Amino acid sequence: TAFVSWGNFESFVSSIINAIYNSAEVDEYEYMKLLVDNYYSKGLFTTVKI
Amino acid sequence: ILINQTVQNDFITSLVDRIGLVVIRQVSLNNPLKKFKKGQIPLGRTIEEI
Amino acid sequence: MRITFNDVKTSLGITESYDIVNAIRNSQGDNFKSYVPLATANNVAEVGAGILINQTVQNDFITSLVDRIGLVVIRQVSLNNPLKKFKKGQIPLGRTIEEIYTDITKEKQYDAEEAEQKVFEREMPNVKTLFHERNRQGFYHQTIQDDSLKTAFVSWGNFESFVSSIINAIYNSAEVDEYEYMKLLVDNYYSKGLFTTVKIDEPTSSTGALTEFVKKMRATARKLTLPQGSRDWNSMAVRTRSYMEDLHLIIDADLEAELDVDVLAKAFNMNRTDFLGNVTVIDGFASTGLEAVLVDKDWFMVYDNLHKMETVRNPRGLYWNYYYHVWQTLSVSRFANAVAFVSGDVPAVTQVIVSPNIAAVKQGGQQQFTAYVRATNAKDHKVVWSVEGGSTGTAITGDGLLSVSGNEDNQLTVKATVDIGTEDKPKLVVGEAVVSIRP
Amino acid sequence: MRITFNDVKTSLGITESYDIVNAIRNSQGDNFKSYVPLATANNVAEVGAG
Amino acid sequence: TQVIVSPNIAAVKQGGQQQFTAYVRATNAKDHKVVWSVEGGSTGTAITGD
């Protein structure tokens, strides 16, 4: 009842579907960055002073 | 306008102004750190490096 | 786990009238003398109307064996509503329906002198809009255990018959409820006073009450089907015209039986005295005075949005759950003719219609309002005009001219009131309109 | 330019000889018994008039 | 003429509830009102006016 065109309806539901994959990619990137942050926090890097 | 309201036509008060154009915003997000992934592990939980 | 009932008598909810078992034995030359020769009449009268609750009965010969059930019959019915020809198509997308009508204007006298300085004056057309939205959403739920039902049967055919009856009950209920909703539409329309009421209970002069209702319906149909039209048959007080082939008359079974006995029988060439519109017979309306309703084909504005059926299975409880979802919008059009034939004591004035039902004026503008009183009698009733919501300086004259003060910002309501009751017992019929202020 | 209405009663000048909702709710064996099983009867009586 | 209760036979639990419908067979058009009662005898079991 919120739409008038079947094309718009399908586009909206497809966007809803793609939101899941977008969130998954964002979370994976954040996890991979957290890996480096944790490695630095535990002090296992070779530190070079600047 | 965050929340819209019904507006009557200026010439005729009985008629209400309609919605002309509807646009759907689409976005696709990836992660730069995708090339650093290895293969799959169907069975098991532990990886040993020697 | 044992569901059992005790101390249940044959006459559970029976209110006897004259105790025929005593009447037969006390009859001396009465109308019951024919039943005296009967011997087992007492046993027949004890259980001749059936037994609501069963109980095990031992046979007369040996008090150890148990009488058995020797016949099982299952009754099934198919029901469908007759008011399906009044339904429109489907609405796949959207919720609201807009209906726009343009009325006629008023004539002005030719005057070149006044024509000097108002060549570019604006005359707003008299248009009206009506909105209809979806209002019915529902579903029917039924569960089938189809494992505990096997202990109540001894054959593999009665089980399937019972299952089929259970399945068909959902569709029967759906049809019945659709019919009830479509009848409730008419009942609510009559309750709100939006019909045009015609009294058919009065005699012609002294004894011409045999065909008075026939004459009234024929005359009403003829005057609704007029080339020039009229504004006395719709709740919007708008000049409109109907057509004979588009007029549908829903009558009562009592009215049909009265007609085809007191008119169509003792009359030659009954094509000149039969009903005019397309006749549909129902059981009877819920209103006290309603007897028949004559409407236009476009009066009904009912649409359907959803009709679906979905099933689920619970394996832990071992049953099937059935859902039947029905979504519909049920509305009527106020721009179509609508006459209700009544026979009771209706009020003198039905309702008052204000022709401009919506207005938008500025702080220095003026508005003109017109009132139509749907009086059921020949008497004339005066109309009192009032305005509410104004701060100060906003007044409306007795003619219906509303003026707005130059310094205010509020939503005004204009009310036209007709008093039909006597002194110390007022009965007010009010028609109101909404006015907005544009700064 | 922009004219709006804040809130308008659903009746708006409708005078009822009797209240159908109340008649349906408070009834025993009358002609309104058939309307009791209906679920959206109140909504239909409120909106279906137009 | 008579009064008919739609569920003639019922089985309920100690914490359950039951709904009953009454149909009155009236030979005239006059309306009638019906009173509900229970003669189970247990304290705490009660039937409302509906």
State which H helix or E strand residue E5 sits in. strand E2-5
Q: Residues with Cβ < 8 Å from C308, sequence gap 6 or more?
A: C324, C325
State which H helix or E strand residue A17 sits in. helix A6-41
Interchain contact, D3 vs B7, CB within 8 Å: yes
Q: Residues with Cβ < 8 Å from C425, sequence gap 6 or more?
A: none
Distance CA C274, CA A31 (A): 85
Chain D partners of E26 at a C-beta cutoff of 8 Å?
29
Chain D, 1-50: which have a CB under 8 Å from a chain C CB?
1, 3-6, 8, 12-20, 23, 30-32, 34-35, 37-41, 43-50
Best CA proximity match to D12, nearest among C51, C109, C353? C353
Interchain contact, C359 vs B13, CB within 8 Å: yes
What CA–CA distances, in Å, run from C61 to C41, C44, C58, E31, E47?
Answer: 22, 20, 9, 52, 45
Q: For residue C269, give both structure tokens.
A: 């060439």
Best CA proximity match to C293, nearest among C305, C302, C280? C280
Chain C partners of E11 at a C-beta cutoff of 8 Å?
3
Q: For residue C135, give both structure tokens.
A: 């209002």
Q: Is C61 in contact with C155 (CB distance < 8 Å)? A: no
Maximum distance among all Cα pairs of chain E, rounded to whole angstroms: 41
End-to-end CA distance of chain A: 61
State which H helix or E strand residue D24 sits in. helix D20-25
State which H helix or E strand residue E24 sits in. strand E22-25
| Tally: H helices and E strands in chain E | 0, 2
Interchain contact, A15 vs B28, CB within 8 Å: no
Q: Is C95 on the interface with A (CB under 8 A)?
A: yes
In terms of CA atoms, which chain C residue is nearest residue D29? C286
How would you classify the pairing of strands C136-144 and C319-329? Answer: antiparallel
End-to-end CA distance of chain C: 77
Best CA proximity match to C235, nearest among C275, C188, C276? C188
Chain A partners of B28 at a C-beta cutoff of 8 Å?
18, 22
- State the nearest Cα–Cα gap between D5 and chain B, in angstroms: 8
Best CA proximity match to C300, nearest among C184, C192, C380, C175? C184
Interchain contact, C134 vs A3, CB within 8 Å: no
AA letter at C47: V
Q: How many residues does chain E have?
A: 50
Best CA proximity match to C189, nearest among D21, D48, D38? D48
Q: Is C298 in contact with C336 (CB distance < 8 Å)? A: yes
Q: Is C74 in contact with C162 (CB distance < 8 Å)? A: yes
Beta bridge partners of C130: C99
Distance CA C197, CA C269 (A): 30
DSSP helix/strand/coil, A43: coil
In terms of CA atoms, which chain C residue is nearest residue A7? C93
Q: Give how far the C-alpha of residue C332 lies from the chain's centroid of Cα atoms, to the nearest Å.
A: 11
Distance CA C184, CA E39 (A): 38
In terms of CA atoms, which chain E residue is nearest residue D27? E33
Nearest to B13 among C98, C100, C358 (CB): C358
Chain A partners of C94 at a C-beta cutoff of 8 Å?
1, 3-4
Interchain contact, C124 vs B12, CB within 8 Å: yes
AA letter at C84: K
Distance CA C276, CA C339 (A): 14
End-to-end CA distance of chain D: 28
Best CA proximity match to C212, nearest among C225, C222, C198, C232? C198
State which H helix or E strand residue A38 sits in. helix A6-41
How would you classify the pairing of strands C338-342 and C366-368? Answer: unpaired
For chain C, the three-class secondary structure string (H helix, E strand, C coil) is: CCCCCCCCCCCCCCCCCCCHHHHHHHCCCCHHHHHCCCCCHHHHHHCCCCCCCCCCCECCCCCCCECCCCCCCCCCCCCCCCCCCCEEEECCCCCEEEEEEECCCCCCCCCCCHHHCCCCCCCCCCEEEEEEECCEEEEEEEEECCCCHHHHCCCCCHHHHHHHHHHHHHHHHHHHHHHHHHHHHHHHHHHCCCCEEEECCCCCCCCCCCCHHHHHHHHHHHHHCCCCCECCCCCCCCCECCCHHHEEEEEEHHHHHHHHHHCCCCCCCHHHCCCCCEEEEECCCCCCCEEEEEEECCCECEEEEEEEEEEEEECCCCEEEEEEEEEEECCECCCCCEEEEECCCCCCEEEEEECCCEEEECCCCEEECCEEEEECCCCCCCCEEEEECCCCCCCECCCCEEECCCCCCCCEEEEEEEECCCCCCCCEEEEEEEEEECC
- What is the stated resolution of the deposited model, in angstroms? 3.0
Q: Cα dihedral sign for C108, C113, C118, C120?
A: positive
DSSP helix/strand/coil, A34: helix
- State the nearest Cα–Cα gap between E16 and chain C, in angstroms: 15
Chain E partners of D28 at a C-beta cutoff of 8 Å?
22, 24, 31-34
Best CA proximity match to C412, nearest among C398, C395, C429, C399? C395
State which H helix or E strand residue E4 sits in. strand E2-5
In terms of CA atoms, which chain D residue is nearest residue B13? D3
Distance CA B7, CA B22 (A): 18
Distance CA C265, CA E4 (A): 40
